[PDB]
Amino acid sequence: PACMERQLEAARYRSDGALLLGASSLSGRCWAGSLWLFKDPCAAPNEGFCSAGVQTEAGVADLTWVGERGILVASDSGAVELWELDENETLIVSKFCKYEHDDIVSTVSVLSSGTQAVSGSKDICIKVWDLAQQVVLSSYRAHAAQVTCVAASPHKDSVFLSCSEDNRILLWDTRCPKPASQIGPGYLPTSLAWHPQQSEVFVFGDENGTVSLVDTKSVLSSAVHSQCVTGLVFSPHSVPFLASLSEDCSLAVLDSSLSELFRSQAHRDFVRDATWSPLNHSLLTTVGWDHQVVHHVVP
Amino acid sequence: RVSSGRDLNCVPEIADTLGAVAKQGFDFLCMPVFHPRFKREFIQEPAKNRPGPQTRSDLLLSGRDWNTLIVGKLSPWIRPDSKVEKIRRNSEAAMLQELNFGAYLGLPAFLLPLNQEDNTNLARVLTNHIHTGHHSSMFWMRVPLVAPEDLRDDIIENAPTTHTEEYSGEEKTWMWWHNFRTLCDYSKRIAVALEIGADLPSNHVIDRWLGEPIKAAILPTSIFLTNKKGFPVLSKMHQRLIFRLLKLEVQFIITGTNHHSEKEFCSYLQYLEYLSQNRPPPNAYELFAKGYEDYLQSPLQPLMDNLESQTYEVFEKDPIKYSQYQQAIYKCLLDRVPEEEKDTNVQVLMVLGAGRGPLVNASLRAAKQADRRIKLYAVEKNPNAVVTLENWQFEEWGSQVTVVSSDMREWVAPEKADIIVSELLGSFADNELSPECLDGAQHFLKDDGVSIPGEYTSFLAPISSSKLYNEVRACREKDRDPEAQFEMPYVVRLHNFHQLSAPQPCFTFSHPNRDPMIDNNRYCTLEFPVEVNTVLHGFAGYFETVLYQDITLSIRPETHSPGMFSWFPILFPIKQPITVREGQTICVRFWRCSNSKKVWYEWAVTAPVCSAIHNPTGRSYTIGL
Ligand SMILES: CSC[C@H]1O[C@@H](n2cnc3c(N)ncnc32)[C@H](O)[C@@H]1O
Ligand SMILES: Cn1c(N)nc2cccc(Cl)c21
């Protein structure tokens, strides 16, 4: 832990306020990644003032917290990795590393119970994992192209969404003999985000820069960005806001009717992840491939 | 030995990854030239002004490693046929960037995927890149046997996988390739990297790829079963496909992670070598023909041209062919000379076209085992071969053999022959003007004379081989018609091809010809029932001949003479390939034209589509009388 990879891929906050950072080396001699923890969010991305850090064998495509000390990682090596903090939270030790996908694991999401997770990879395969037994519970091949994003249901542990380059948006329910249910022709979906206060509502952004509002019991949309929508994160407020990320190097915050409230062009490269501050809800942190960690004051 | 490579999408260190892959036993590595997740903007700011470097440096490997060990791979995010214009433009610039960088490294091959139906703009960028210079790089198109949509799990509740068997729909992936290479105008630098799935399609879908330029077979680690010890194996049907690919000498590529945790990464590799050590070794014909697979050659003309020394040597290197001739002569002598006349009746044999004297010795051996007396006449027109005969006649044969250095049509024989033996047959029976020679030599044969061979027949069969079509297409010469290469036959060991119908007889000739309609001009019409979908590229040529009664020689594959390797099938190509649907009939028309100077073949297709008449007036091909 001395050189941090320039392409910052993910940024997530936890309960107390520590900042999780996942970077990848997308160019140069070595192509790998790293995991970092910043109890001082203002100190990021400087490595000399961090709480912990570890080097991974390959790049980091997508990660997410598993409670308060667990780190689930989707690696370019085709393996789903789990890293856990020690009792002192000074080291980041690898819990397990299972190579089950045959290509880059592109997306990963923890289910509601926190004991299981769903992983989407470029191998057109979606797998359900048991973090306790470190084994793959199920392996589904429902799509016909690269799995772009998978998002677990925030409260139903058997439900999760998935979108692939086959222009399919599938709603899953492992309680049924056929868990996948297609949702309704446009451009390919690229990001999925459930509504934090409505069980039957989610939003998705396409490769053309259009965020749409979808009701599960089958439509509102708006042209937010000029390129592919990378991520969609809801704010933790009572009436949550919608932060949208894109390859146009811009950040936008939408309201309930998908109207543009805040616009940020601070990043010079792609904007990858965005996380809201649990301590100050009006603060929103974003990272990108320009090695920047900007803290936005959302009005 | 098996040339096998390792496909990867995650390479942290080229020096480390290449060393480990080599230690496992691989020959090359399929890796991306740029990071697969490293998208790059080319138009809109500020993402296009991204500071470099864009990828690794070429100094990380030697020029020999880039030329033999590394195979390029297109970035997955590159979508030249995207319905979004912005994504389409960036993909075009990115595709050229990665293709130009692969050429900068001198990579032997670059991988590009065929994963949907429309790859038009993808084909244009590649065709545009090919005509930017005259480099020597191969482009492997990754196309799966079964489309991912047709192999998905039936786990979508509101979109079930239709269980109705559709014949053409199961062949959709081949349609992708066919359209792609046609858009690229059959480029010699565009091959197929067939990717195999867990469930093989129906046998007709696999047969679709016969004759296609397959250079690589991709085998994921997921299609491997598990034995009792816990090692990767393959189903008996998958093994059946692996053996079919070994005959094409394709390069197998192992992709995917290690799903057999215990056994390390070399276990999938040894299993292929295990199958490669467990197959029937070549049989005489197969062994002699190794190296000439799909190698076009000009049909010999022993009449117009004088064959070289080693040309006759190849003819003599076949004992089965001459053992039949000796048998036929041995049989005819008994039927013509009864036992009570074994010491009084002497038969007059005339080897018409003796060459260096293989039939002369075969005649001497036949009269010995038959206990009959013969008087030999070795007639040969090639003055160089007469030197071998007259040297043979002085040292060994003697006064028994009478060498005649003349043409059999002009030679005035001193007496008439009881039997005439000749080997004036080519790969297409009469393509060496055997009828014209024996007809001219028919006057000095007794009224009850026997002709060996007594008759011969040509056989045609429609074939499909996009590879061989390119072979002929590449034979355009400077100072002649640009399409003449399609209007001339070729003697070739047919290998990477697909026979579309059982062969049918074409031209037949009888000797002695007693008919008052002495005319070797022929017009035949053939109709071939085609039970599959394919593209017609040409017609295979074979022949059968009757030496005497039941003694026969043949290159017709169903009735092929065993062990006789001294004849390769002939090939009559066509200018434009013709598409043939299942159930349709291919109607071909063949003419055997001739004037006082030359003899030639004319042919044309009339069903399902009419082609142009090939070689009219022998403008592109003639056999010298
Ligand atoms: C042994 S392969 C055929 C042989 O027949 C010879 N041949 C072909 N046509 C004639 C002909 N018209 N008269 C004599 N020999 C011939 C060729 O020169 C060759 O040696
Ligand atoms: C005798 N002969 C003639 N005439 N053409 C041939 C072509 C190939 C092999 C042989 Cl042995 C041939």
PDB file of C-alpha atoms in Angstrom, chain A residues 79-292:
ATOM      1  CA  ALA A  79     -13.517 -14.295  -8.928  1.00  0.00           C
ATOM      2  CA  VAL A  80     -15.765 -12.826  -6.252  1.00  0.00           C
ATOM      3  CA  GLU A  81     -13.610 -11.667  -3.336  1.00  0.00           C
ATOM      4  CA  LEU A  82     -14.577 -10.896   0.258  1.00  0.00           C
ATOM      5  CA  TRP A  83     -12.293  -8.780   2.447  1.00  0.00           C
ATOM      6  CA  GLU A  84     -12.849  -8.226   6.166  1.00  0.00           C
ATOM      7  CA  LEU A  85     -11.398  -5.696   8.590  1.00  0.00           C
ATOM      8  CA  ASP A  86      -9.616  -6.925  11.699  1.00  0.00           C
ATOM      9  CA  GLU A  87     -10.711  -6.066  15.234  1.00  0.00           C
ATOM     10  CA  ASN A  88      -8.522  -2.939  15.157  1.00  0.00           C
ATOM     11  CA  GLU A  89      -9.615  -1.925  11.615  1.00  0.00           C
ATOM     12  CA  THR A  90      -5.986  -1.327  10.601  1.00  0.00           C
ATOM     13  CA  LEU A  91      -5.632  -4.248   8.159  1.00  0.00           C
ATOM     14  CA  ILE A  92      -7.797  -5.553   5.312  1.00  0.00           C
ATOM     15  CA  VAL A  93      -7.471  -9.348   5.193  1.00  0.00           C
ATOM     16  CA  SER A  94      -8.978 -11.482   2.435  1.00  0.00           C
ATOM     17  CA  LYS A  95     -11.760 -13.744   3.698  1.00  0.00           C
ATOM     18  CA  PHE A  96     -12.256 -15.887   0.588  1.00  0.00           C
ATOM     19  CA  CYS A  97     -11.590 -15.762  -3.155  1.00  0.00           C
ATOM     20  CA  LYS A  98     -13.681 -18.139  -5.288  1.00  0.00           C
ATOM     21  CA  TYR A  99     -13.097 -18.237  -9.064  1.00  0.00           C
ATOM     22  CA  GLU A 100     -16.541 -19.189 -10.375  1.00  0.00           C
ATOM     23  CA  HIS A 101     -17.260 -16.840 -13.286  1.00  0.00           C
ATOM     24  CA  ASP A 102     -15.460 -17.448 -16.580  1.00  0.00           C
ATOM     25  CA  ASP A 103     -14.994 -13.736 -17.361  1.00  0.00           C
ATOM     26  CA  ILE A 104     -14.782 -10.334 -15.668  1.00  0.00           C
ATOM     27  CA  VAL A 105     -17.279  -9.976 -12.825  1.00  0.00           C
ATOM     28  CA  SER A 106     -18.866  -6.644 -13.734  1.00  0.00           C
ATOM     29  CA  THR A 107     -21.392  -6.040 -10.941  1.00  0.00           C
ATOM     30  CA  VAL A 108     -22.156  -7.237  -7.417  1.00  0.00           C
ATOM     31  CA  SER A 109     -24.829  -6.457  -4.824  1.00  0.00           C
ATOM     32  CA  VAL A 110     -25.581  -7.659  -1.288  1.00  0.00           C
ATOM     33  CA  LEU A 111     -29.079  -8.966  -0.585  1.00  0.00           C
ATOM     34  CA  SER A 112     -31.353  -7.761   2.215  1.00  0.00           C
ATOM     35  CA  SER A 113     -30.378 -10.382   4.806  1.00  0.00           C
ATOM     36  CA  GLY A 114     -26.704  -9.470   4.401  1.00  0.00           C
ATOM     37  CA  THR A 115     -25.833 -13.187   4.345  1.00  0.00           C
ATOM     38  CA  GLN A 116     -26.253 -13.643   0.571  1.00  0.00           C
ATOM     39  CA  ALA A 117     -25.286 -11.663  -2.517  1.00  0.00           C
ATOM     40  CA  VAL A 118     -25.784 -11.668  -6.287  1.00  0.00           C
ATOM     41  CA  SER A 119     -22.950 -11.264  -8.803  1.00  0.00           C
ATOM     42  CA  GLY A 120     -23.200 -10.337 -12.481  1.00  0.00           C
ATOM     43  CA  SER A 121     -20.323 -10.963 -14.870  1.00  0.00           C
ATOM     44  CA  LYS A 122     -19.427 -10.571 -18.533  1.00  0.00           C
ATOM     45  CA  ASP A 123     -19.907 -14.351 -18.923  1.00  0.00           C
ATOM     46  CA  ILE A 124     -23.691 -13.778 -19.314  1.00  0.00           C
ATOM     47  CA  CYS A 125     -24.045 -15.587 -15.969  1.00  0.00           C
ATOM     48  CA  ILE A 126     -25.657 -14.365 -12.746  1.00  0.00           C
ATOM     49  CA  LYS A 127     -24.824 -16.224  -9.538  1.00  0.00           C
ATOM     50  CA  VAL A 128     -26.293 -16.245  -6.028  1.00  0.00           C
ATOM     51  CA  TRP A 129     -23.712 -16.596  -3.264  1.00  0.00           C
ATOM     52  CA  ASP A 130     -23.697 -17.768   0.355  1.00  0.00           C
ATOM     53  CA  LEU A 131     -21.158 -15.523   2.092  1.00  0.00           C
ATOM     54  CA  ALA A 132     -21.126 -17.847   5.117  1.00  0.00           C
ATOM     55  CA  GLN A 133     -20.431 -21.162   3.368  1.00  0.00           C
ATOM     56  CA  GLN A 134     -18.355 -19.406   0.651  1.00  0.00           C
ATOM     57  CA  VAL A 135     -20.209 -21.360  -2.053  1.00  0.00           C
ATOM     58  CA  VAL A 136     -22.398 -20.463  -5.021  1.00  0.00           C
ATOM     59  CA  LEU A 137     -26.035 -21.267  -4.273  1.00  0.00           C
ATOM     60  CA  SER A 138     -27.379 -20.785  -7.808  1.00  0.00           C
ATOM     61  CA  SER A 139     -26.047 -19.967 -11.274  1.00  0.00           C
ATOM     62  CA  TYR A 140     -28.512 -18.474 -13.761  1.00  0.00           C
ATOM     63  CA  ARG A 141     -27.963 -17.868 -17.480  1.00  0.00           C
ATOM     64  CA  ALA A 142     -31.035 -15.782 -18.298  1.00  0.00           C
ATOM     65  CA  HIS A 143     -29.495 -13.003 -20.392  1.00  0.00           C
ATOM     66  CA  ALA A 144     -27.952 -13.295 -23.857  1.00  0.00           C
ATOM     67  CA  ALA A 145     -25.101 -10.766 -23.542  1.00  0.00           C
ATOM     68  CA  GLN A 146     -22.833  -9.100 -20.986  1.00  0.00           C
ATOM     69  CA  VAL A 147     -24.456  -8.539 -17.594  1.00  0.00           C
ATOM     70  CA  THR A 148     -24.181  -4.785 -17.013  1.00  0.00           C
ATOM     71  CA  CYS A 149     -25.710  -4.286 -13.552  1.00  0.00           C
ATOM     72  CA  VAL A 150     -27.423  -6.303 -10.821  1.00  0.00           C
ATOM     73  CA  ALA A 151     -29.156  -4.609  -7.880  1.00  0.00           C
ATOM     74  CA  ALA A 152     -30.552  -6.513  -4.909  1.00  0.00           C
ATOM     75  CA  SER A 153     -33.940  -5.593  -3.510  1.00  0.00           C
ATOM     76  CA  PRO A 154     -33.500  -3.293  -0.486  1.00  0.00           C
ATOM     77  CA  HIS A 155     -35.976  -5.273   1.647  1.00  0.00           C
ATOM     78  CA  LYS A 156     -36.956  -8.510  -0.166  1.00  0.00           C
ATOM     79  CA  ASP A 157     -34.082 -10.972   0.144  1.00  0.00           C
ATOM     80  CA  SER A 158     -35.291 -13.160  -2.755  1.00  0.00           C
ATOM     81  CA  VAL A 159     -35.748 -10.293  -5.245  1.00  0.00           C
ATOM     82  CA  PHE A 160     -33.161  -8.438  -7.329  1.00  0.00           C
ATOM     83  CA  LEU A 161     -32.959  -6.609 -10.648  1.00  0.00           C
ATOM     84  CA  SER A 162     -30.548  -7.202 -13.508  1.00  0.00           C
ATOM     85  CA  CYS A 163     -29.848  -5.562 -16.862  1.00  0.00           C
ATOM     86  CA  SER A 164     -27.686  -6.796 -19.728  1.00  0.00           C
ATOM     87  CA  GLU A 165     -26.567  -5.629 -23.162  1.00  0.00           C
ATOM     88  CA  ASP A 166     -29.330  -7.810 -24.657  1.00  0.00           C
ATOM     89  CA  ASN A 167     -31.653  -4.850 -23.876  1.00  0.00           C
ATOM     90  CA  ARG A 168     -33.330  -6.966 -21.170  1.00  0.00           C
ATOM     91  CA  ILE A 169     -34.307  -5.685 -17.721  1.00  0.00           C
ATOM     92  CA  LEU A 170     -35.132  -8.730 -15.593  1.00  0.00           C
ATOM     93  CA  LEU A 171     -36.927  -8.712 -12.245  1.00  0.00           C
ATOM     94  CA  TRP A 172     -35.913 -11.763 -10.221  1.00  0.00           C
ATOM     95  CA  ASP A 173     -37.771 -13.710  -7.529  1.00  0.00           C
ATOM     96  CA  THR A 174     -36.047 -16.933  -6.464  1.00  0.00           C
ATOM     97  CA  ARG A 175     -39.279 -18.033  -4.742  1.00  0.00           C
ATOM     98  CA  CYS A 176     -40.744 -18.884  -8.173  1.00  0.00           C
ATOM     99  CA  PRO A 177     -39.912 -21.836 -10.457  1.00  0.00           C
ATOM    100  CA  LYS A 178     -38.916 -19.252 -13.082  1.00  0.00           C
ATOM    101  CA  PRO A 179     -37.294 -16.411 -11.101  1.00  0.00           C
ATOM    102  CA  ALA A 180     -36.632 -14.053 -14.022  1.00  0.00           C
ATOM    103  CA  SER A 181     -39.403 -11.739 -15.242  1.00  0.00           C
ATOM    104  CA  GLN A 182     -38.691  -9.363 -18.120  1.00  0.00           C
ATOM    105  CA  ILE A 183     -39.782  -5.724 -17.859  1.00  0.00           C
ATOM    106  CA  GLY A 184     -40.914  -3.525 -20.738  1.00  0.00           C
ATOM    107  CA  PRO A 185     -37.162  -1.783 -26.992  1.00  0.00           C
ATOM    108  CA  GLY A 186     -35.070   1.334 -26.404  1.00  0.00           C
ATOM    109  CA  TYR A 187     -31.357   1.723 -25.887  1.00  0.00           C
ATOM    110  CA  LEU A 188     -29.487  -0.648 -23.608  1.00  0.00           C
ATOM    111  CA  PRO A 189     -29.841  -0.207 -19.828  1.00  0.00           C
ATOM    112  CA  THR A 190     -26.669   0.599 -17.911  1.00  0.00           C
ATOM    113  CA  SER A 191     -27.599   1.278 -14.258  1.00  0.00           C
ATOM    114  CA  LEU A 192     -30.322   0.143 -11.847  1.00  0.00           C
ATOM    115  CA  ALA A 193     -31.418   1.679  -8.544  1.00  0.00           C
ATOM    116  CA  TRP A 194     -34.339   0.653  -6.349  1.00  0.00           C
ATOM    117  CA  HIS A 195     -36.433   3.256  -4.559  1.00  0.00           C
ATOM    118  CA  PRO A 196     -35.456   3.406  -0.856  1.00  0.00           C
ATOM    119  CA  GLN A 197     -39.045   4.090   0.295  1.00  0.00           C
ATOM    120  CA  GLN A 198     -41.168   2.265  -2.325  1.00  0.00           C
ATOM    121  CA  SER A 199     -40.903  -1.491  -2.833  1.00  0.00           C
ATOM    122  CA  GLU A 200     -42.401  -1.582  -6.348  1.00  0.00           C
ATOM    123  CA  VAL A 201     -40.452   1.348  -7.847  1.00  0.00           C
ATOM    124  CA  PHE A 202     -36.973   1.607  -9.352  1.00  0.00           C
ATOM    125  CA  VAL A 203     -35.051   3.801 -11.788  1.00  0.00           C
ATOM    126  CA  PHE A 204     -32.739   2.873 -14.651  1.00  0.00           C
ATOM    127  CA  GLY A 205     -30.441   4.799 -16.983  1.00  0.00           C
ATOM    128  CA  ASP A 206     -29.624   3.846 -20.563  1.00  0.00           C
ATOM    129  CA  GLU A 207     -26.505   4.205 -22.699  1.00  0.00           C
ATOM    130  CA  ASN A 208     -28.061   7.285 -24.352  1.00  0.00           C
ATOM    131  CA  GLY A 209     -28.229   9.344 -21.154  1.00  0.00           C
ATOM    132  CA  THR A 210     -31.884   8.936 -20.162  1.00  0.00           C
ATOM    133  CA  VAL A 211     -32.950   8.158 -16.598  1.00  0.00           C
ATOM    134  CA  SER A 212     -36.430   6.635 -16.406  1.00  0.00           C
ATOM    135  CA  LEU A 213     -38.922   5.975 -13.608  1.00  0.00           C
ATOM    136  CA  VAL A 214     -40.531   2.520 -13.683  1.00  0.00           C
ATOM    137  CA  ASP A 215     -43.402   1.127 -11.611  1.00  0.00           C
ATOM    138  CA  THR A 216     -43.155  -2.637 -11.088  1.00  0.00           C
ATOM    139  CA  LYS A 217     -46.895  -3.125 -11.650  1.00  0.00           C
ATOM    140  CA  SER A 218     -46.590  -2.145 -15.315  1.00  0.00           C
ATOM    141  CA  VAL A 219     -43.578   5.772 -17.448  1.00  0.00           C
ATOM    142  CA  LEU A 220     -41.622   8.952 -16.692  1.00  0.00           C
ATOM    143  CA  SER A 221     -38.182   9.778 -18.081  1.00  0.00           C
ATOM    144  CA  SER A 222     -35.902  12.721 -18.809  1.00  0.00           C
ATOM    145  CA  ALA A 223     -32.720  13.318 -20.805  1.00  0.00           C
ATOM    146  CA  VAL A 224     -30.266  13.895 -17.960  1.00  0.00           C
ATOM    147  CA  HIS A 225     -26.864  13.214 -19.547  1.00  0.00           C
ATOM    148  CA  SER A 226     -25.273  13.325 -22.996  1.00  0.00           C
ATOM    149  CA  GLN A 227     -23.569   9.902 -22.758  1.00  0.00           C
ATOM    150  CA  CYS A 228     -24.031   6.558 -21.003  1.00  0.00           C
ATOM    151  CA  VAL A 229     -25.485   6.753 -17.492  1.00  0.00           C
ATOM    152  CA  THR A 230     -23.007   5.017 -15.216  1.00  0.00           C
ATOM    153  CA  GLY A 231     -24.645   5.000 -11.787  1.00  0.00           C
ATOM    154  CA  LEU A 232     -27.790   5.999  -9.931  1.00  0.00           C
ATOM    155  CA  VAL A 233     -27.771   6.528  -6.154  1.00  0.00           C
ATOM    156  CA  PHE A 234     -30.685   7.700  -3.999  1.00  0.00           C
ATOM    157  CA  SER A 235     -30.107  10.153  -1.159  1.00  0.00           C
ATOM    158  CA  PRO A 236     -30.947   9.054   2.411  1.00  0.00           C
ATOM    159  CA  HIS A 237     -33.524  11.821   2.946  1.00  0.00           C
ATOM    160  CA  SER A 238     -37.189  11.145   3.676  1.00  0.00           C
ATOM    161  CA  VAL A 239     -38.043  12.301   0.151  1.00  0.00           C
ATOM    162  CA  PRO A 240     -34.872  10.981  -1.511  1.00  0.00           C
ATOM    163  CA  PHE A 241     -33.028  12.720  -4.321  1.00  0.00           C
ATOM    164  CA  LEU A 242     -31.550  10.909  -7.328  1.00  0.00           C
ATOM    165  CA  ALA A 243     -27.856  11.364  -8.125  1.00  0.00           C
ATOM    166  CA  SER A 244     -26.983  10.298 -11.675  1.00  0.00           C
ATOM    167  CA  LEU A 245     -23.514   9.573 -13.044  1.00  0.00           C
ATOM    168  CA  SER A 246     -22.393   9.393 -16.651  1.00  0.00           C
ATOM    169  CA  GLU A 247     -19.462   9.167 -19.049  1.00  0.00           C
ATOM    170  CA  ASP A 248     -19.954  12.836 -19.984  1.00  0.00           C
ATOM    171  CA  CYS A 249     -17.927  13.752 -16.847  1.00  0.00           C
ATOM    172  CA  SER A 250     -20.862  15.391 -15.054  1.00  0.00           C
ATOM    173  CA  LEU A 251     -22.937  14.844 -11.914  1.00  0.00           C
ATOM    174  CA  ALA A 252     -26.655  15.609 -11.678  1.00  0.00           C
ATOM    175  CA  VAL A 253     -29.078  15.451  -8.747  1.00  0.00           C
ATOM    176  CA  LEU A 254     -32.756  14.950  -9.584  1.00  0.00           C
ATOM    177  CA  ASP A 255     -35.935  15.317  -7.544  1.00  0.00           C
ATOM    178  CA  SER A 256     -39.097  13.200  -7.495  1.00  0.00           C
ATOM    179  CA  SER A 257     -40.135  14.182 -11.046  1.00  0.00           C
ATOM    180  CA  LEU A 258     -36.605  13.699 -12.488  1.00  0.00           C
ATOM    181  CA  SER A 259     -36.009  17.461 -12.717  1.00  0.00           C
ATOM    182  CA  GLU A 260     -32.429  18.729 -12.621  1.00  0.00           C
ATOM    183  CA  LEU A 261     -31.711  20.407  -9.274  1.00  0.00           C
ATOM    184  CA  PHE A 262     -27.895  20.342  -9.062  1.00  0.00           C
ATOM    185  CA  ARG A 263     -25.244  20.006 -11.772  1.00  0.00           C
ATOM    186  CA  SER A 264     -21.535  19.398 -11.173  1.00  0.00           C
ATOM    187  CA  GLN A 265     -18.809  19.365 -13.835  1.00  0.00           C
ATOM    188  CA  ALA A 266     -15.871  19.160 -11.424  1.00  0.00           C
ATOM    189  CA  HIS A 267     -14.615  15.821 -12.751  1.00  0.00           C
ATOM    190  CA  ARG A 268     -12.438  15.820 -15.867  1.00  0.00           C
ATOM    191  CA  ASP A 269     -12.707  12.069 -16.579  1.00  0.00           C
ATOM    192  CA  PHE A 270     -15.488   9.503 -16.186  1.00  0.00           C
ATOM    193  CA  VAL A 271     -17.543   9.651 -12.983  1.00  0.00           C
ATOM    194  CA  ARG A 272     -17.799   6.127 -11.567  1.00  0.00           C
ATOM    195  CA  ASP A 273     -19.398   5.980  -8.102  1.00  0.00           C
ATOM    196  CA  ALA A 274     -21.253   8.338  -5.774  1.00  0.00           C
ATOM    197  CA  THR A 275     -22.069   7.937  -2.086  1.00  0.00           C
ATOM    198  CA  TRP A 276     -24.095  10.120   0.265  1.00  0.00           C
ATOM    199  CA  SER A 277     -22.762  11.054   3.684  1.00  0.00           C
ATOM    200  CA  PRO A 278     -24.692   9.375   6.538  1.00  0.00           C
ATOM    201  CA  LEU A 279     -23.662  12.126   8.972  1.00  0.00           C
ATOM    202  CA  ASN A 280     -24.513  15.112   6.734  1.00  0.00           C
ATOM    203  CA  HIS A 281     -27.249  14.127   4.274  1.00  0.00           C
ATOM    204  CA  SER A 282     -26.670  17.313   2.242  1.00  0.00           C
ATOM    205  CA  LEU A 283     -23.122  16.168   1.349  1.00  0.00           C
ATOM    206  CA  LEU A 284     -22.444  13.836  -1.587  1.00  0.00           C
ATOM    207  CA  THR A 285     -19.047  12.342  -2.455  1.00  0.00           C
ATOM    208  CA  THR A 286     -18.090  11.367  -6.010  1.00  0.00           C
ATOM    209  CA  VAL A 287     -14.981   9.752  -7.488  1.00  0.00           C
ATOM    210  CA  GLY A 288     -13.763   9.129 -11.004  1.00  0.00           C
ATOM    211  CA  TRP A 289     -10.915   8.021 -13.236  1.00  0.00           C
ATOM    212  CA  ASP A 290      -9.306  11.473 -12.873  1.00  0.00           C
ATOM    213  CA  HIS A 291      -8.197  10.391  -9.360  1.00  0.00           C
ATOM    214  CA  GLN A 292     -10.478  13.030  -7.800  1.00  0.00           C
TER     215      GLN A 292
END
